[PDB]
Amino acid sequence: VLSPADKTNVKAAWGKVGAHAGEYGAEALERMFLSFPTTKTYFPHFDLSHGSAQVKGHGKKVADALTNAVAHVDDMPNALSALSDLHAHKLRVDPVNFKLLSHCLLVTLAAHLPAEFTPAVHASLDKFLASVSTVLTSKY
Amino acid sequence: VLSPADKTNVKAAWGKVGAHAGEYGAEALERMFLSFPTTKTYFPHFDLSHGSAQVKGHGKKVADALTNAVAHVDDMPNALSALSDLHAHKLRVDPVNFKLLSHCLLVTLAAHLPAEFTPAVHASLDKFLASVSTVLTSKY
Amino acid sequence: VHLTPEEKSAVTALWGKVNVDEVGGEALGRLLVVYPWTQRFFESFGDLSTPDAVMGNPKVKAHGKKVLGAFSDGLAHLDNLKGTFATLSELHCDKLHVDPENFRLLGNVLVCVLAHHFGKEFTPPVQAAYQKVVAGVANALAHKYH
Amino acid sequence: VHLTPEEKSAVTALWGKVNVDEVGGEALGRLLVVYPWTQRFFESFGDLSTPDAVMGNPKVKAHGKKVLGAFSDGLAHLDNLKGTFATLSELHCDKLHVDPENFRLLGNVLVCVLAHHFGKEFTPPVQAAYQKVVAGVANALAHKYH
Numbered sequence: 093v094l095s096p097a098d099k100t101n102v103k104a105a106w107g108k109v110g111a112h113a114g115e116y117g118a119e120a121l122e123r124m125f126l127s128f129p130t131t132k133t134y135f136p137h138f139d140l141s142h143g144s145a146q147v148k149g150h151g152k153k154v155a156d157a158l159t160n161a162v163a164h165v166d167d168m169p170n171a172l173s174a175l176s177d178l179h180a181h182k183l184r185v186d187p188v189n190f191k192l193l194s195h196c197l198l199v200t201l202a203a204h205l206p207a208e209f210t211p212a213v214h215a216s217l218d219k220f221l222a223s224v225s226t227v228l229t230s231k232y
Numbered sequence: 233v234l235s236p237a238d239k240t241n242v243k244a245a246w247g248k249v250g251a252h253a254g255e256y257g258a259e260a261l262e263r264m265f266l267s268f269p270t271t272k273t274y275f276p277h278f279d280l281s282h283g284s285a286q287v288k289g290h291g292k293k294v295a296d297a298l299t300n301a302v303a304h305v306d307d308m309p310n311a312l313s314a315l316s317d318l319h320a321h322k323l324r325v326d327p328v329n330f331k332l333l334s335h336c337l338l339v340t341l342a343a344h345l346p347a348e349f350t351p352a353v354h355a356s357l358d359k360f361l362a363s364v365s366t367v368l369t370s371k372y
Numbered sequence: 373v374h375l376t377p378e379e380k381s382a383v384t385a386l387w388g389k390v391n392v393d394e395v396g397g398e399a400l401g402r403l404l405v406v407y408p409w410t411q412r413f414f415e416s417f418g419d420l421s422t423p424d425a426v427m428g429n430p431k432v433k434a435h436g437k438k439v440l441g442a443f444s445d446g447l448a449h450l451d452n453l454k455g456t457f458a459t460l461s462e463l464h465c466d467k468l469h470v471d472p473e474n475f476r477l478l479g480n481v482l483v484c485v486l487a488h489h490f491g492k493e494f495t496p497p498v499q500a501a502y503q504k505v506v507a508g509v510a511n512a513l514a515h516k517y518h
Numbered sequence: 519v520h521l522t523p524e525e526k527s528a529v530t531a532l533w534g535k536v537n538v539d540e541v542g543g544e545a546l547g548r549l550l551v552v553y554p555w556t557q558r559f560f561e562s563f564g565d566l567s568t569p570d571a572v573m574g575n576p577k578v579k580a581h582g583k584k585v586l587g588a589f590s591d592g593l594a595h596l597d598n599l600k601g602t603f604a605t606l607s608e609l610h611c612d613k614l615h616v617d618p619e620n621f622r623l624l625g626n627v628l629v630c631v632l633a634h635h636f637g638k639e640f641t642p643p644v645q646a647a648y649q650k651v652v653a654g655v656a657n658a659l660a661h662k663y664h
């Protein structure tokens with residue numbers, strides 16, 4: 093579940109992120125790969141070095157998926173249907189890894205939104221990312 | 233998600249369990265309390281000894297909730313609404329604990345259904361119990 | 373890990389009844405079927421399209437033997453699981469890069485296999501003792517992350 | 519746990535800038551708000567009805583100090599975390615009965631608090647080094663389950 097409060101908190105947070113969405117996505121990816129090196133095995137063909145155009149490009153895609161989820165918060169399974177299929181079936185992502193990327197996305201937001209990242213907003217974002225992760229892991 | 237195959241597997245499994253539902257529930261509880269002693273703290277006022285009428289009684293309630301979920305597999309959040317509220321809000325059950333009880337429920341079924349507990353049926357039951365657990369943890 | 377004598381007895385007594393040529397491939401097989409992302413680390417093994425495919429698969433049955441071989445080993449060395457699994461940790465951690473939650477899962481699947489095969493014999497205290505074992509093995513395998 | 523010199527530097531340099539009277543209660547507070555089941559082990563502390571209640575609560579701020587005290591300690595003893603936390607493990611495991619996943623969560627919340635306070639300074643390599651630390655602390659705290 094996501095309360096109306098959680099939804100306004102999440103919308104608010106994404107509002108302030110603004111056009112930095114893609115860049116924060118790339119940063120969250122880098123945080124994940126450095127902090128949790130096991131996640132690197134899903135991207136053997138990427139250059140994962142700092143400044144990698146491939147991480148940057150992929151960060152924008154991750155952020156765009158998250159924004160699409162925010163924009164359709166009440167029907168995420170439908171919105172995220174192809175992505176769920178991709179990650180469970182083709183990519184076979186270990187469900188544990190969604191928790192790790194979600195934490196790095198939270199770290200990234202915290203690192204950039206000193207005002208917005210209140211305890212309440214932290215809580216709402218955590219639930220939002222857990223709901224996305226639930227969707228993305230629904231199709232094994 | 234639960235495919236039509238998963239649903240027929242789960243229905244089949246519950247069919248063979250039959251009137252032993254409550255007894256298996258009590259057994260699953262005992263397996264959990266012995267294997268995962270941390271779970272015992274949620275039942276300070278229970279006698280948890282073997283043969284405990286309180287474990288037996290509570291086992292029947294657990295099994296009846298599971299059967300109600302099976303019986304309304306396509307609308308579990310509605311069916312399990314009060315139970316989700318109870319466990320998240322009043323009881324504050326650590327979400328990790330649902331995984332542990334789910335494993336003991338699987339062990340119990342395996343211990344009693346040599347014919348039914350095929351690899352495919354194992355898989356369907358795991359997904360069924362993960363869906364119930366998802367519902368019961370949706371309301372923090 | 374600390375097993376009491378009654379715990380050691382419960383484990384050892386059942387473990388001598390185990391078909392070491394079969395239980396291993398049954399546990400590994402079920403793991404690949406129940407937790408399909410684990411099939412990421414086994415594309416080589418061939419037809420994993422179906423449960424029958426995975427279960428009736430040679431490389432699975434072949435490999436589960438060693439896997440089962442590992443658990444037997446540590447059952448003799450609850451005192452020194454870290455020392456026992458030292459090598460194999462760098463294998464799954466430094467070389468394979470596998471999350472330690474997955475070792476807990478294999479352990480739990482092995483427990484389900486033991487219950488399936490022993491039925492009534494796999495009582496709640498016997499399960500409790502086997503949980504300590506697979507917990508200790510999973511942890512020792514993950515020491516190269518710790 | 520093995521921190522490289524650059525990892526040790528990244529951690530130590532930031533850790534000296536930390537307000538030890540505040541960060542502790544911020545991390546603990548957020549844990550109780552974000553993961554509300556953790557409030558099961560703290561009914562005594564009073565008004566935990568709201569985030570403002572929890573955050574603006576004396577017993578939380580009081581207790582987070584010690585909690586933060588613990589992490590500082592282990593930051594001096596990455597060589598002997600098990601030896602460092604020995605006592606406190608029997609406390610949370612044998613006496614309190616707490617799942618080790620929860621220690622990982624507190625560690626992650628502390629990392630979010632560090633990022634919030636240090637912003638740009640909390641770079642991805644600095645985070646990576648802090649993750650090794652909180653991972654090692656969480657594991658050492660759970661040794662009384664292992």
Ligand code: HEM
Nearest residue numbers: 131134135153154157158179183185189190193224225228
């Ligand atoms: C909030 C969680 C996640 C979101 C929103 C997300 C989003 C996306 C999106 C939008 C793509 C687009 C691919 C494309 O269309 O070009 C993608 C691909 C991919 N994702 Fe994720 N993802 C998430 C979690 C994860 C995790 C945890 C992993 C593994 C650690 C992962 C691994 C991959 C891989 C390997 C690809 C394909 C990379 C390639 O070869 O191009 N994802 N993801």
Ligand code: HEM
Nearest residue numbers: 271274275293294297298319323325329330333364365368
């Ligand atoms: C498949 C998962 C679960 C199911 C189907 C389930 C079902 C139920 C049901 C039907 C009740 C009924 C209470 C009543 O109406 O009298 C109950 C109560 C309760 N459950 Fe669960 N439950 C599950 C998981 C858990 C877990 C993991 C824990 C903690 C380890 C837990 C702890 C409790 C407690 C403490 C009560 C109240 C006990 C009392 O004081 O009477 N439950 N549950």
Ligand code: HEM
Nearest residue numbers: 410413414416438439442443464468470474475478509513
């Ligand atoms: C649970 C998730 C696990 C995964 C995903 C995994 C993955 C793998 C992979 C990919 C290999 C190499 C096989 C190949 O492709 O040639 C391997 C080897 C092996 N694994 Fe696992 N592993 C897991 C857990 C375990 C555990 C818990 C044990 C024993 C306690 C174990 C015992 C072994 C052994 C004994 C070998 C090979 C020995 C040899 O070749 O000399 N594995 N594993």
Ligand code: HEM
Nearest residue numbers: 556559560562584585588589610614616620621624655659
């Ligand atoms: C993460 C979940 C945790 C929970 C739910 C938990 C729970 C508790 C509880 C109930 C107490 C007793 C407080 C009281 O009611 O009087 C306590 C004490 C304490 N905890 Fe935690 N704990 C957790 C993790 C940690 C971690 C990771 C650390 C440090 C690394 C820590 C450090 C301490 C300290 C230093 C004390 C008391 C010291 C003293 O009183 O002498 N806790 N904890």
